[model samples]
Target: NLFVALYDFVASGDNTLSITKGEKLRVLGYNHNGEWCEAQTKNGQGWVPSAYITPVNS
Candidate 1:
């Protein structure tokens, strides 16, 4: 499974990526003790809040 951003998320840190609504992300790994995960998008790759993304069937 992977994740998709349901809404646009403005990043607050350098290690974070600003994602737009309906953007697809490839799950890389977890960070912040599982509170966040590293994901890759067309824009860039960075850490995203786990809650902001929803798992999708691949």
Candidate 2:
């Protein structure tokens, strides 16, 4: 449960999927600029709101 978030999302290719709210994630640090995020699923890597994420609760 690393610090993670989904500030924004994009199409993986030609398909569109509505990423559900409250999807689990794992991230690194606080990136308000959202320039430090990576594609975990199939949406590819990109920036996400930093303030919206917290480290996984272990």
The model with the greatest lDDT is 1
The lDDT of each candidate is 0.86, 0.43
Report the C-alpha displacement of residue 49, candidate 2, in angstroms.
0.9
Q: Please, what is the TM-score per model?
A: 0.82, 0.38
For candidate 2, which ten residues in a row score worst on lDDT? 13-22
- Runs with alpha carbons beyond 4 Å of true place in candidate 2: 4-20, 28-42
Off by over 4 Å in 1: none
The per-residue C-alpha lDDT of model 1 at residue 37 equals 83
Give a tens-digit lDDT track for model 1, residues 1-58. 4788987889998789899888888998987588888999998989888888888774
- CA shift of 8, model 2, Å: 7.6
Using alpha carbons, what is the TM-score of model 1?
A: 0.82
Each prediction's RMSD to truth: 1.8, 5.8
User: Clashing residue pairs, candidate 1?
Assistant: none
